[PDB]
Amino acid sequence: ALLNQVFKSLKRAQDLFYHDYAQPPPMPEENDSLIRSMKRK
């Protein structure tokens, strides 16, 4: 099953970014701007 390979890949990626885990998930600049542009319209 794919779950094992997914688990190992996700776990290593999380571990490499371990110092970033305390940071909130970002809002992309494209997404932030398209909210603002719709609000301005």
Partner 1 sequence: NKAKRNAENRVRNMKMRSQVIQRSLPKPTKVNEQATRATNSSADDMVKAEMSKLLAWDVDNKPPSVIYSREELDAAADLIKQEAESGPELNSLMWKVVEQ
Partner 2 sequence: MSFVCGISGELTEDPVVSQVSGHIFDRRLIVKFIAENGTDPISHGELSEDQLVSLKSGGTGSAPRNVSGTSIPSLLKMLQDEWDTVMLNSFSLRQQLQIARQELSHSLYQHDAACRVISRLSKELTAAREA
Binding site for partner 1 (CB under 8 A): 1-3, 5-6, 10, 12, 15-20
CA pair distance 29, 14, nearest whole angstrom? 23
Q: Does 37 bind partner 2 (CB under 8 A)?
A: yes
How many residues of this chain interact with partner 2, rule: CB under 8 A?
21
Q: Does 12 bind partner 2 (CB under 8 A)?
A: yes
CA pair distance 10, 39, nearest whole angstrom? 36
Q: Does 29 bind partner 2 (CB under 8 A)?
A: no
Q: Does 7 bind partner 2 (CB under 8 A)?
A: no
In sequence order, which residues have a C-beta less than 8 Å from that of residue 14 and are 6 or more positions away?
21
